[PDB]
Each structure stands twice: as structure tokens, then as C-alpha cells.
XYZ file of C-alpha atoms in Angstrom:
657
model
C 0.000 0.000 0.000
C 1.658 3.182 1.237
C 4.908 1.240 1.496
C 4.801 0.955 -2.298
C 4.011 4.674 -2.386
C 7.154 5.613 -0.456
C 9.025 3.091 -2.606
C 7.964 4.860 -5.796
C 8.615 8.348 -4.416
C 12.165 7.677 -3.289
C 12.714 5.548 -6.408
C 11.818 8.174 -8.978
C 13.477 10.922 -6.940
C 16.726 8.958 -6.819
C 16.870 7.828 -10.428
C 15.790 11.241 -11.727
C 18.651 12.731 -9.711
C 21.045 10.107 -11.076
C 19.932 10.813 -14.643
C 20.412 14.525 -13.978
C 23.919 13.823 -12.641
C 25.361 12.981 -16.064
C 24.688 14.832 -19.297
C 26.569 2.900 -3.115
C 23.680 5.140 -4.126
C 22.682 3.074 -7.216
C 23.068 -0.177 -5.275
C 20.852 0.977 -2.416
C 18.202 2.352 -4.753
C 18.080 -0.788 -6.913
C 17.770 -3.020 -3.858
C 14.965 -0.696 -2.769
C 13.163 -1.110 -6.091
C 13.546 -4.879 -5.748
C 12.004 -4.838 -2.274
C 9.307 -2.701 -3.884
C 8.926 -5.386 -6.557
C 8.072 -7.780 -3.715
C 4.550 -6.412 -3.933
C 3.203 -6.609 -7.465
C 3.260 -3.288 -9.304
C 3.000 -2.999 -13.082
C 4.287 0.576 -12.991
C 7.320 -0.669 -11.061
C 7.408 -3.595 -13.491
C 7.943 -1.009 -16.235
C 11.345 0.169 -14.961
C 13.204 -3.105 -15.537
C 15.149 -1.874 -18.630
C 16.269 1.131 -16.586
C 17.437 -1.383 -14.000
C 19.551 -2.997 -16.723
C 21.148 0.261 -17.841
C 21.956 1.029 -14.212
C 23.367 -2.492 -13.747
C 25.752 -1.916 -16.631
C 26.225 1.742 -15.686
C 27.557 1.002 -12.182
C 28.416 -2.715 -12.062
C 30.770 -2.130 -9.116
C 27.743 -1.565 -6.856
C 24.725 -2.864 -8.768
C 26.346 -6.161 -9.757
C 27.816 -6.323 -6.254
C 24.336 -6.275 -4.699
C 22.959 -8.303 -7.607
C 22.990 -11.389 -5.378
C 19.833 -10.155 -3.639
C 17.647 -10.918 -6.660
C 17.496 -14.720 -6.828
C 17.783 -14.840 -3.046
C 15.207 -12.028 -2.984
C 12.689 -12.493 -5.795
C 11.734 -15.789 -7.488
C 8.432 -14.431 -8.859
C 7.801 -15.526 -12.446
C 8.146 -12.037 -13.881
C 10.295 -10.438 -16.601
C 8.242 -11.997 -19.405
C 8.321 -9.022 -21.764
C 12.074 -8.586 -21.158
C 13.095 -12.196 -21.818
C 14.923 -11.183 -25.002
C 16.749 -8.499 -23.031
C 17.661 -11.067 -20.376
C 18.991 -13.635 -22.807
C 20.974 -11.004 -24.701
C 22.369 -9.975 -21.308
C 23.534 -13.540 -20.674
C 25.455 -13.519 -23.976
C 28.147 -11.206 -22.592
C 30.109 -11.081 -19.325
C 27.073 -9.875 -17.402
C 24.486 -10.879 -14.786
C 24.339 -14.660 -14.431
C 21.953 -15.410 -11.553
C 19.187 -14.195 -13.845
C 20.070 -17.346 -15.774
C 18.859 -19.133 -12.654
C 15.792 -16.877 -12.705
C 14.989 -18.004 -16.242
C 15.765 -21.552 -15.104
C 12.915 -21.149 -12.625
C 10.803 -19.565 -15.369
C 11.290 -22.513 -17.714
C 10.662 -24.810 -14.749
C 7.248 -23.159 -14.587
C 6.979 -23.877 -18.333
C 9.264 -23.431 -21.369
C 6.472 -21.915 -23.476
C 7.654 -18.638 -25.080
C 11.163 -19.162 -23.670
C 12.211 -21.437 -26.523
C 11.831 -18.751 -29.210
C 13.973 -16.233 -27.268
C 16.556 -19.003 -26.942
C 16.449 -19.578 -30.704
C 16.755 -15.873 -31.487
C 19.657 -15.702 -29.012
C 21.370 -18.845 -30.333
C 23.626 -16.574 -32.401
C 25.184 -15.241 -29.171
C 37.030 -17.616 -22.783
C 37.839 -15.472 -19.759
C 34.254 -15.039 -18.548
C 31.957 -15.657 -21.509
C 32.762 -19.365 -21.365
C 30.833 -19.420 -18.086
C 27.842 -18.034 -19.983
C 28.385 -20.699 -22.641
C 28.245 -23.375 -19.936
C 25.074 -21.809 -18.530
C 23.318 -21.748 -21.898
C 24.508 -25.297 -22.593
C 22.806 -26.296 -19.350
C 19.757 -24.331 -20.521
C 19.530 -26.173 -23.838
C 20.045 -29.397 -21.901
C 16.941 -28.393 -19.953
C 15.392 -27.589 -23.354
C 14.161 -31.109 -23.989
C 12.117 -32.237 -27.033
C 13.456 -29.289 -29.030
C 13.492 -31.494 -32.116
C 9.706 -31.239 -32.087
C 10.052 -27.450 -32.269
C 12.509 -27.728 -35.151
C 9.966 -30.052 -36.765
C 7.484 -27.186 -36.509
C 10.155 -24.973 -38.080
C 10.517 -27.445 -40.954
C 6.733 -27.494 -41.324
C 6.644 -23.697 -41.464
C 9.396 -23.232 -44.035
C 8.398 -26.214 -46.201
C 5.836 -23.857 -47.766
C 8.332 -21.067 -48.490
C 9.020 -20.330 -52.143
C 12.702 -21.081 -52.892
C 12.932 -18.034 -55.179
C 12.829 -15.642 -52.223
C 15.477 -17.692 -50.419
C 17.732 -17.569 -53.482
C 17.183 -13.825 -53.882
C 18.149 -13.259 -50.248
C 21.220 -15.453 -50.734
C 22.145 -13.321 -53.753
C 21.775 -10.144 -51.702
C 24.033 -11.685 -49.057
C 26.719 -12.663 -51.577
C 26.507 -9.163 -53.058
C 27.130 -7.783 -49.570
C 30.068 -10.186 -49.279
C 36.568 -14.318 -49.259
C 35.274 -17.796 -48.298
C 35.659 -17.062 -44.569
C 31.897 -16.608 -44.352
C 31.171 -16.891 -48.087
C 31.851 -20.632 -47.933
C 29.714 -20.818 -44.785
C 26.912 -19.087 -46.686
C 27.363 -21.474 -49.609
C 27.068 -24.422 -47.221
C 23.939 -22.931 -45.646
C 22.391 -22.306 -49.071
C 23.243 -25.888 -49.987
C 21.689 -27.354 -46.832
C 18.626 -25.184 -47.462
C 17.944 -25.917 -51.138
C 20.880 -27.502 -52.949
C 20.848 -30.583 -50.735
C 19.635 -33.647 -52.684
C 16.581 -34.118 -50.455
C 14.588 -31.833 -48.215
C 14.344 -33.312 -44.692
C 10.664 -32.377 -44.730
C 7.936 -34.253 -46.581
C 7.395 -31.608 -49.252
C 6.856 -32.045 -52.943
C 6.818 -28.479 -54.307
C 10.141 -27.459 -52.783
C 11.629 -30.910 -53.388
C 10.825 -30.890 -57.104
C 12.084 -27.310 -57.438
C 15.362 -28.097 -55.701
C 15.928 -31.349 -57.622
C 15.247 -29.486 -60.872
C 17.246 -26.297 -60.344
C 19.551 -26.267 -57.313
C 21.721 -29.126 -58.549
C 22.213 -27.345 -61.875
C 23.012 -24.071 -60.116
C 25.538 -25.785 -57.838
C 27.075 -27.361 -60.943
C 27.398 -23.824 -62.301
C 28.918 -22.732 -58.970
C 32.434 -24.112 -59.131
C 33.132 -22.379 -55.816
C 31.983 -25.047 -53.373
C 29.182 -10.262 -58.968
C 28.401 -10.886 -62.628
C 28.004 -14.628 -62.020
C 25.602 -13.915 -59.157
C 23.601 -11.596 -61.414
C 23.521 -14.208 -64.188
C 22.226 -16.839 -61.767
C 19.697 -14.267 -60.544
C 18.295 -13.803 -64.044
C 18.383 -17.568 -64.625
C 16.318 -18.375 -61.541
C 13.938 -15.447 -61.937
C 13.147 -16.372 -65.549
C 11.868 -19.774 -64.358
C 8.296 -20.626 -63.348
C 6.679 -17.796 -61.382
C 4.248 -19.922 -59.390
C 4.092 -20.712 -55.669
C 1.703 -23.390 -54.406
C 2.927 -25.852 -51.742
C 1.542 -29.409 -52.077
C -2.242 -29.339 -51.752
C -4.475 -27.134 -49.648
C -3.876 -29.782 -47.016
C -0.183 -29.645 -46.130
C 0.965 -33.108 -47.082
C 4.352 -31.373 -47.160
C 4.143 -30.780 -43.404
C 4.175 -33.863 -41.145
C 2.141 -32.334 -38.321
C -0.162 -30.439 -40.694
C -0.764 -33.859 -42.283
C -0.989 -36.252 -39.309
C 0.891 -37.152 -36.098
C -1.188 -35.731 -33.260
C 0.349 -35.364 -29.800
C 0.665 -38.856 -28.325
C 2.193 -39.956 -25.026
C 5.619 -39.999 -26.690
C 5.091 -36.546 -28.200
C 5.257 -33.590 -25.849
C 2.297 -31.234 -25.605
C 2.937 -27.946 -27.410
C 1.007 -24.750 -26.707
C -0.308 -22.283 -29.275
C 2.669 -19.938 -29.750
C 2.231 -16.856 -27.603
C -0.575 -16.140 -25.187
C 1.177 -15.599 -21.831
C 1.853 -12.300 -20.056
C 2.433 -12.781 -16.332
C 3.490 -10.686 -13.355
C 4.868 -13.340 -11.025
C 1.439 -14.945 -11.030
C 1.158 -18.641 -11.868
C 0.014 -18.524 -15.470
C -2.991 -20.807 -16.050
C -1.486 -23.877 -17.691
C -4.710 -25.196 -19.193
C -5.129 -22.917 -22.215
C -5.337 -23.761 -25.916
C -2.533 -25.963 -27.243
C -1.340 -26.866 -30.733
C -3.926 -29.463 -31.756
C -5.934 -29.702 -34.952
C -5.659 -27.908 -38.270
C -7.923 -26.682 -41.077
C -5.758 -26.471 -44.179
C -7.226 -24.193 -46.846
C -4.503 -21.550 -47.085
C -4.832 -18.322 -49.074
C -1.857 -16.858 -50.947
C -1.484 -13.075 -51.103
C 1.493 -11.295 -52.676
C 2.094 -8.303 -50.403
C 5.832 -8.078 -49.675
C 7.166 -11.655 -49.727
C 3.952 -13.341 -50.891
C 2.764 -14.165 -47.343
C -0.018 -16.632 -46.632
C -2.830 -16.421 -44.087
C -2.816 -19.849 -42.437
C -5.854 -21.325 -40.680
C -5.051 -23.311 -37.535
C -7.598 -25.224 -35.481
C -7.154 -24.923 -31.736
C -6.855 -27.609 -29.091
C -10.076 -26.385 -27.455
C -11.931 -26.494 -30.810
C -11.341 -22.757 -31.278
C -9.699 -22.191 -34.651
C -6.954 -19.553 -34.556
C -5.819 -18.306 -37.977
C -2.306 -16.962 -38.394
C 0.130 -15.677 -41.016
C 3.340 -17.301 -42.192
C 6.314 -15.084 -42.997
C 9.721 -15.445 -44.619
C 12.773 -13.304 -43.901
C 12.791 -9.758 -42.428
C 13.683 -10.838 -38.855
C 11.241 -10.043 -36.068
C 12.963 -8.610 -33.022
C 12.071 -5.006 -33.896
C 8.352 -5.754 -34.185
C 8.482 -7.437 -30.782
C 10.264 -4.399 -29.363
C 7.734 -1.923 -30.744
C 5.033 -4.245 -29.417
C 6.298 -3.951 -25.842
C 6.615 -0.228 -26.503
C 2.900 -0.269 -27.293
C 2.085 -2.103 -24.070
C 4.248 0.196 -21.950
C 2.582 3.210 -23.574
C -0.769 1.617 -22.741
C 0.357 1.121 -19.151
C 1.415 4.768 -18.996
C -2.034 5.721 -20.279
C -3.673 3.493 -17.669
C -1.690 4.959 -14.779
C -2.311 8.487 -16.068
C -5.320 9.824 -14.179
C -6.484 12.124 -16.982
C -5.977 9.480 -19.667
C -8.038 7.065 -17.582
C -10.638 9.824 -17.164
C -10.974 9.952 -20.938
C -10.661 6.126 -20.871
C -7.774 6.398 -23.314
C -6.396 3.004 -24.309
C -4.863 1.297 -27.333
C -5.146 -2.415 -28.057
C -2.775 -4.462 -30.194
C -2.138 -8.014 -31.396
C 0.411 -10.788 -30.919
C 3.285 -11.428 -33.326
C 5.704 -14.276 -32.636
C 9.252 -14.612 -34.029
C 11.106 -17.869 -34.530
C 14.224 -17.016 -36.568
C 15.272 -14.402 -39.089
C 13.679 -16.605 -41.762
C 10.652 -17.444 -39.597
C 8.029 -15.198 -38.044
C 4.439 -15.829 -37.015
C 1.649 -13.250 -37.262
C -1.879 -13.577 -35.898
C -5.076 -12.578 -37.668
C -8.457 -11.579 -36.278
C -10.585 -12.112 -39.429
C -13.282 -10.048 -37.693
C -11.596 -6.871 -38.949
C -11.365 -5.015 -42.247
C -8.800 -2.700 -43.790
C -9.512 0.768 -45.122
C -9.215 -0.033 -48.839
C -12.051 -2.519 -49.324
C -14.117 -0.659 -46.727
C -13.981 2.594 -48.689
C -14.514 0.730 -51.962
C -17.672 -1.041 -50.794
C -18.893 2.213 -49.262
C -18.426 3.660 -52.748
C -21.131 2.718 -55.218
C -20.282 0.442 -58.131
C -20.929 3.138 -60.731
C -18.957 5.663 -58.670
C -15.947 3.364 -58.383
C -16.166 2.468 -62.075
C -16.201 6.157 -63.009
C -13.219 6.746 -60.732
C -11.176 3.820 -62.054
C -11.943 4.612 -65.695
C -10.640 8.088 -66.463
C -9.264 9.880 -63.360
C -6.745 8.507 -60.871
C -3.493 9.809 -59.422
C -1.535 8.995 -62.626
C -4.249 10.545 -64.848
C -4.271 13.504 -62.447
C -0.483 13.966 -62.213
C 0.889 12.906 -65.612
C 1.420 16.588 -66.365
C 2.703 17.194 -62.826
C 5.365 14.572 -63.607
C 6.092 15.362 -67.256
C 6.816 7.818 -66.218
C 9.704 7.195 -63.828
C 12.654 9.576 -63.692
C 10.322 12.490 -64.403
C 9.227 12.888 -60.771
C 12.565 14.313 -59.527
C 12.608 17.114 -62.090
C 9.363 18.801 -61.056
C 10.049 17.816 -57.467
C 12.970 20.194 -57.956
C 10.696 22.617 -59.824
C 7.995 22.500 -57.136
C 6.474 25.760 -55.906
C 3.455 26.963 -53.960
C 1.539 27.623 -57.187
C 1.849 24.038 -58.384
C 1.310 22.972 -54.760
C -2.155 24.501 -54.640
C -2.707 23.394 -58.247
C -2.082 19.752 -57.351
C -4.178 20.127 -54.203
C -7.113 21.375 -56.270
C -6.560 18.644 -58.858
C -6.602 15.870 -56.262
C -9.567 17.313 -54.346
C -11.569 17.555 -57.570
C -10.472 14.100 -58.731
C -11.445 12.281 -55.528
C -15.028 12.333 -54.182
C -15.964 12.703 -50.523
C -18.492 11.561 -47.863
C -17.504 7.902 -48.416
C -16.422 7.449 -44.793
C -19.729 8.849 -43.568
C -21.572 6.498 -45.920
C -19.559 3.594 -44.517
C -20.294 4.489 -40.899
C -24.001 5.134 -41.435
C -24.363 1.838 -43.287
C -22.429 -0.175 -40.691
C -24.216 1.438 -37.739
C -27.930 1.237 -36.987
C -28.616 3.144 -33.779
C -27.923 6.882 -34.113
C -26.419 7.427 -30.674
C -24.377 4.255 -31.138
C -23.242 5.749 -34.452
C -21.966 8.832 -32.628
C -20.302 6.785 -29.895
C -18.495 4.460 -32.300
C -17.422 7.325 -34.541
C -16.006 9.356 -31.652
C -14.225 6.286 -30.283
C -12.778 5.531 -33.713
C -11.541 9.093 -34.158
C -9.885 9.125 -30.732
C -8.274 5.728 -31.308
C -7.013 6.765 -34.744
C -5.503 9.965 -33.369
C -3.738 8.206 -30.518
C -2.350 5.376 -32.663
C -1.208 7.750 -35.404
C 0.676 9.983 -32.999
C 2.137 6.954 -31.210
C 3.550 5.539 -34.417
C 4.711 9.021 -35.410
C 6.718 9.049 -32.182
C 7.994 5.617 -33.203
C 8.746 6.957 -36.695
C 6.595 4.331 -38.386
C 5.987 4.587 -42.111
C 2.304 3.722 -42.543
C 1.882 4.554 -46.206
C -1.249 3.020 -47.703
C -4.744 2.244 -46.452
C -3.681 -1.359 -45.825
C -1.440 0.011 -43.074
C -4.675 0.120 -41.046
C -7.164 -2.551 -40.052
C -10.483 -1.735 -38.365
C -12.839 -4.141 -36.582
C -16.564 -3.594 -37.171
C -17.581 -4.619 -33.672
C -16.091 -1.748 -31.684
C -14.843 0.658 -34.355
C -11.179 0.203 -33.438
C -8.352 0.226 -35.975
C -4.871 -1.295 -35.680
C -1.749 -0.275 -37.552
C -0.051 -2.583 -40.041
C 3.457 -2.774 -41.566
C 5.722 -2.080 -38.613
C 8.738 -2.961 -40.763
C 9.569 0.743 -41.098
C 10.616 2.580 -37.943
C 12.273 5.850 -36.912
C 12.162 7.131 -40.478
C 14.761 4.586 -41.577
C 12.552 3.774 -44.557
C 12.333 7.495 -45.294
C 16.127 7.640 -45.076
C 16.844 4.815 -47.515
C 13.904 5.042 -49.925
C 14.713 7.149 -53.019
C 11.514 9.171 -52.826
C 11.068 10.617 -49.314
C 7.896 9.887 -47.348
C 7.854 12.632 -44.721
C 4.559 13.345 -42.949
C 3.265 13.192 -39.361
C 0.600 10.551 -39.992
C -1.823 9.090 -42.537
C -4.159 12.018 -43.224
C -6.524 12.597 -46.138
C -9.584 14.606 -47.111
C -11.786 11.894 -45.601
C -10.218 12.306 -42.171
C -10.545 16.048 -42.750
C -14.289 15.875 -43.502
C -14.940 13.258 -40.798
C -17.543 15.803 -39.702
C -18.219 19.140 -41.364
C -17.859 21.473 -38.316
C -14.484 19.883 -37.489
C -11.441 22.137 -37.848
C -9.013 19.491 -36.491
C -8.334 21.826 -33.540
C -10.659 19.944 -31.190
C -10.882 16.237 -30.435
C -7.686 14.823 -31.921
C -5.884 18.024 -30.943
C -6.820 17.382 -27.314
C -5.887 13.717 -27.674
C -2.447 14.658 -28.992
C -1.992 17.210 -26.210
C -2.976 14.677 -23.541
C -0.627 12.056 -24.944
C 2.280 14.473 -25.193
C 2.242 16.150 -21.794
C 2.201 12.712 -20.114
C 6.013 13.020 -19.773
C 9.739 10.505 -20.034
C 10.980 7.069 -19.002
C 10.720 5.672 -22.539
C 14.336 6.648 -23.258
C 15.777 3.850 -21.132
C 13.340 1.194 -22.321
C 13.121 1.774 -26.085
C 16.514 0.096 -26.628
C 18.471 -2.270 -24.423
C 21.815 -3.432 -25.845
C 22.119 -3.122 -29.605
C 18.585 -3.114 -31.133
C 18.865 -5.895 -33.697
C 22.210 -5.872 -35.591
C 21.899 -5.703 -39.444
C 18.332 -4.305 -39.652
C 19.013 -1.373 -42.085
C 21.888 -2.547 -44.336
C 19.714 -5.669 -44.716
C 25.724 4.151 -39.221
C 24.806 4.185 -35.545
C 21.393 3.152 -34.137
C 21.857 5.029 -30.871
C 21.636 8.133 -33.043
C 18.080 7.047 -33.854
C 17.403 6.455 -30.156
C 18.738 9.914 -29.292
C 16.604 11.506 -32.011
C 13.577 9.738 -30.541
C 14.422 10.984 -27.058
C 14.927 14.498 -28.446
C 11.451 14.223 -29.953
C 10.140 13.156 -26.547
C 11.886 16.057 -24.807
C 10.571 18.430 -27.463
C 11.964 19.239 -30.889
C 10.639 20.887 -34.016
C 9.338 18.104 -36.302
C 10.668 20.030 -39.299
C 14.113 19.953 -37.672
C 13.629 16.237 -36.992
C 12.832 15.573 -40.649
C 15.788 17.708 -41.739
C 18.272 15.827 -39.573
C 16.775 12.538 -40.750
C 17.231 13.632 -44.372
C 20.839 14.607 -43.592
C 21.690 10.957 -44.411
C 21.851 10.234 -48.145
C 19.337 12.848 -49.263
C 21.984 15.558 -48.877
C 24.103 13.744 -51.461
C 20.910 13.343 -53.457
C 19.753 16.462 -55.331
C 16.692 18.559 -54.401
C 17.853 18.370 -50.777
C 17.286 22.101 -50.379
C 13.775 21.614 -51.782
C 13.154 18.830 -49.270
C 14.318 20.921 -46.325
C 12.305 23.913 -47.577
C 9.081 21.922 -47.844
C 9.820 20.409 -44.432
C 10.298 23.853 -42.880
C 7.155 25.163 -44.561
C 6.069 26.420 -47.974
C 4.243 29.393 -46.421
C 5.629 32.491 -44.742
C 2.909 32.073 -42.126
C 3.845 28.393 -41.845
C 7.549 29.076 -41.185
C 7.239 30.240 -37.592
C 7.902 27.174 -35.410
C 10.931 27.985 -33.271
C 9.333 27.079 -29.918
C 9.042 23.248 -30.250
C 12.764 22.834 -30.888
C 14.677 22.549 -27.600
C 11.647 22.064 -25.383
C 8.155 20.708 -25.956
C 5.179 23.040 -25.628
C 2.458 20.518 -26.480
C -0.157 22.498 -28.381
C 2.499 24.382 -30.338
C 4.207 21.125 -31.300
C 1.015 19.451 -32.478
C -0.204 22.509 -34.382
C 3.247 22.693 -35.985
C 2.933 19.062 -37.068
C -0.519 19.839 -38.454
C 0.340 23.096 -40.233
C 3.921 23.096 -41.494
C 4.319 19.306 -41.721
C 1.021 17.642 -42.733
C -0.963 19.376 -45.471
C 1.030 21.733 -47.731
C 4.128 19.583 -48.196
C 1.865 16.778 -49.418
C -0.084 19.260 -51.546
C 3.217 20.201 -53.174
C 4.988 16.853 -53.478
C 3.581 13.431 -52.652
C 4.164 9.769 -53.396
C 1.633 8.162 -55.715
C 1.370 5.004 -53.614
C 0.838 7.067 -50.464
C -2.747 7.719 -51.684
C -3.052 11.321 -50.420
C -6.354 11.803 -52.246
C -7.679 8.559 -50.759
């Protein structure tokens, strides 16, 4: 009760002072936060990453009094920081937390195995850690079943994507790791038989990989030639049958006495509580899989549950999934901050998200609700058939901007030649080309009761505002309408495509994609009296003045090596913390564009349109070096959202839509 209160007061006083110190005491305070952690407290549960940076910051005292954690707290906690823990064990660091995770896996190994796999990459002191993790994997019994699931999951992957990734890797790369890569490529595809029971992949490998390895005497131009050779082959991906005869468990082999019982991957989030170990397990399957070519031709898989509750999911190829996990826990900690905020709870402000599960770099698992719809098809079905036919026939963004471009190559030249006159010209062209009221049609047709209509619409607007500003803080590039996904049972929408963060996509994409959030004329005309200075303005203000502990917890050790190339990430972390402390978003965009785009031409045009195309727009000198809430959000609305898009915009961004 009040003991926790005094705990929190002295805790945040002390660590705020310690943070202020730099631009004995740590040991006593961290032992105090542990004896606070005795009693369950989610807000205190939030400061674990800060505990790690203070462990590494002052090991001489923190690691000295480390011993009072196993001897102090055995509560099955730390679930959302398991990746952080197991990355900590990789180096000469805390080691009794290995005993803590020993206790955790003694409770159950569910959702510990995947962190172990993602940490399998990983002497004077590190050999001790190697012994500890060897003991861990010794405790990790029946892992071959899990690798059998891995084989089942990647037996449906098209080998063309694997070969293309291998080609990118060899382009990045003499035989020190090139031969290792060749061996891995061989064991993946060029091996005479796939260990799985496939037929699609097996026939493809037996037809092409042997020939390609014959071409490859080893084990640039040759890689390119092989690239053309294996892209000019059959462009068709369909693993054997709708039923996965390729996959042993998707075919047969239920869990017997000999086979261990495996849980549905990812449903546990504890706080030292004994998690209920009677939930849905991996049992049953309904195999009619749909193939959609979105980024790597992913497939929405349908999986029957143990408790006769089917749980559909999505299979995924490469594009490793530690960053999506990280931004997920960022979402939950933001939600916890909202919950503990009295005013946010007064408005009942809350965001909900989903579960995404990583296995390897070449293996990630994504859920699906199937009771939700994206914006594209929603707007299209709200639009009448004749209306959509008239739109698709003559006028679209290319029919509206062919002159504003003049094909590819032609966009840079009038991007350079951009001006306020053509800015307003293109704005008028797009606003005349696209109709309106479609959102209102959609809401009035989906809702029946009028007051319920108002309630759902207001809730949707608030949720959209909060999620858009959250992912703006996270620097997420949510380009198209498919970046959003709304469920027609509570009017809540969830973001999609978290593969772009902190403006890294803006940095490396040729065309820039700078904007605060996904805004269009429909969100403008959401209701006619709205001037966008009311509801979402208040929501943004309330979210922003809620601070600043996110700096310690956004990153832990390295934040996913590779990532981009596949520079210095702590630069991105410091830009994010500068945004949190208060910076001009135009300045933020400028410093983001200071990588690559400065070598690129039209850089002065980019920084000018970021600063503001209007004399009245170029006034924001208050948000830089100190946040002032309303000024910052009105800056993002005025000199960052509308006119830059009205001047220059990406065709796939769908600004008119």
C-alpha cells in the first residue's frame, strides 16, 4: 500500500537525480526497487530496462548487490524482457538471472524457446555463460519437435525468395563466411533431399539447385547471371495441396504420449502470477490456405485450436522479427502509462494491439483476427459500383499527375521545380479528382442506432488519433490504407506494416515519405464542423504532456544488428528521445534527411518543404529545444502535414484517398 508509495517516491526521486547527474547510491536504490517489486506493481514492473542500464552503468555496486535478486525475488516475472535477459547472458554480465529463467522454464518453457532460438547466435568469462546456456539447452528437452514445426513452417516457403536473399548476401560479401553461406544455401535448397515431406520445394530443388551448384564451381556478374536464370523460371508458388501433405504435423501425427504437448505460440503475459497452464494448445488444423502477394507473398494460415477454437495466423519469410516485438512492448508500456495516467483514464484512453511471434530471421508468425477489415475494401464497398467504375476509368493519381510529372525519372525534375503555385494546383486537382463523404456512408451503413453511431465514430476518431501519434513518435511509415485494419464490432483500428521505424525507410527510400501521420480529405471531412483543432488536438496534447521514461526502455543493448543494411542506431534512439523532450518536427525531418538525401539532389527543396512552404507556416521555433504541447502538435498539423503533401507526394501514399 503506502509502502509501495514511499518506494515509488524515493525511487523516482533517486533515479531522476542520477539521470540529472550525467549529461553505493545506485546499489541501495536498486535493492529498494527490488524490495518494492516484492509487492506486485506494473508501474514498477515497467522500470526493468532502466534497471539494466543502471546495472551496466555502475556494475561495481549494482552487480555487487545483484545477489539479492534470486535470493530475494523468485516471482515468475520479466516476461516481456526475456529477449533483453537472454541477450544480457550472452556477454560477461548478470548470471543469476540465468537461474531466474531456469525457474521460469521450470514453470513452463512456453515462449522461452523462441527467445533461446533468437539468441542462439550469441574464454575469460563468456565461457561461463556458454556453460550456462549449454545447461539451458540441456533443460530444453524435445526441441526437435520445435525444429519439426520450423521445418513445417518453411516447407511452404518459395525457394525463389530464399535464393534472392542469398544473392543479396553474396553481393554484400573471401570464403571465410562466403563458404559458410554457400554451405547454408546448400543445406537449405541444394541438398539432394529436403528433410521435410514436401513435394513443391523438393521438385524445385531437384530441378534447379543441382544445376546451379554445378554452375557454382566455388563449393558479382556470375551472381547476377544466376539471378536472371532463376527469376526467368516458373513464377508460381503453391505448396503441395491445400492440405499440407508437405508438413508432417499439418498432415498427421497428433500429440501422443511420446510426443510432448505444445502450446499455441504466444498467449502468456504474467506478473509473477502462476500462469494458467490449461489454455489452448497446438492441436488440430484446417488447411485451406490463401496466398497473397504483399511483400514476400505471405499466406494467411488457418489453424484449429486444441479447445476447438480455430486460430488463424500468417506465415512469414525473412525480415527478422525482433524489432516488431520491441515496438510491441513499446505499445504495451505506452498503454500502461495511459492506464496509470489519471487524466488518460478519465478519458478512458487506451490502445489495443495483437500478438506477433518470431522464430528465426527466416521465420516469423503473425496472428489474424478475421473479424476486422482494412480501409481499402471498406472505402470501396462504401463507394457505389458506378462511382468506383467512373473513378477507375478516367481519373486517378496517374491521370491527375501525368502533367505534374512530365513515367519514372520524371518525378525528380518537377520535385525540384515544385512551388506553392503548383502545390495549390495539385491540391485542387486531387480534391476535384477524388469524391468525398464515403467514410460517412460507410459508418451510417455499418451502424444502426444513431447514438451508437456517434459513440463508435467518436471512439474511432480518438483511437485513430492516438495510434497515429504513437507511431509518429515511433517513426513508423504507414503509407497506404492497408497500413490500417479496423474491426466492425467496436470501431477500433490497428496499424499494419511495422517494418519501417524511426524514419529509416524514409532515409533509404529514393523518394522521401515525410509526414506526421496518414491524413486525407476523408479524415478532414470526418464531420463538417471539425477544424481538427478539437478532439484529436486534445488527444495529442494529452498524450504528449504525459512526460519521459521511454528513453531507457526503447533500446536495451544493440537493437537488432543488421536491420538497415539488410551508421549508428543510438543516433536514432537519441533523435527519438529528443522528440520526446521536445523538438521541431521540421528539424527532426531535416536531420533525418541529412543521411543520403543531402548527397541526393533537391535536398534544399526537401528541407524547404519540411520547414514550410508558407511564410505564415515558417514560424515554429518554440518546439525545438523544449516541448510546448499544443504548439508542437499545431506545428505538425500546419507546417508538416498538409502543404508539403499538396506540393509533393508519393503516388502510392494515396493522399487523395
